[PDB]
Amino acid sequence: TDIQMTQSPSSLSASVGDRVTITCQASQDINNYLIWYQQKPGQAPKLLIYDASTLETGVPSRFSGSGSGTEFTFTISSLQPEDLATYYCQQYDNLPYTFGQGTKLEIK
């Protein structure tokens, strides 16, 4: 009865230059009130994308958000060595704001 965010995958390993794709299903429609964060190890989440597809100022072109309704996607189109992190989607349509369980990226 709060909103449940279903993020996939739980983890992934990929090489530098790879296209990384992450999905978030929302348990009910949220319009596009969804944010994507990046949590570098030992740091706070940092907002990359809001409104499901809007890049924050000074966020690199390789990050993008697709979707609206209940299915959303996050892409890093070419993965850089500084992109090692856990990425989270999050709805802000209604309090409480709920996070997907996250996608932990490792680099080879």
Single-letter code of the amino acid located at 5:
M
CA distances (Å), 78 to each of 33, 34, 61, 62, 82, in order?
A: 26, 23, 10, 6, 12
Quote the least distance from Cβ 102 to a second copy, whole Å: 5
Tokens representing 29? 């429609």
Q: Residues in the site for a second copy, rule: CB under 8 A?
A: 35, 43-47, 50-51, 56, 88, 92, 95-102
Q: Which is nearer to a second copy, 34 or 79 (CB)?
A: 34
Q: What is the distance between the alpha carbons of residues 89 and 62, in angstroms, rounded to a whole number?
A: 17
Residue 83 or 88: the one with the smaller Cβ distance to a second copy is: 88
Residue type, 89: C
Decide whether 67 or 100 has the Cβ nearer to a second copy.
Answer: 100
Residue 92 C-beta: closest distance to a second copy, Å? 7
What's the min distance (Å) between Cβ of 41 and a second copy?
A: 11
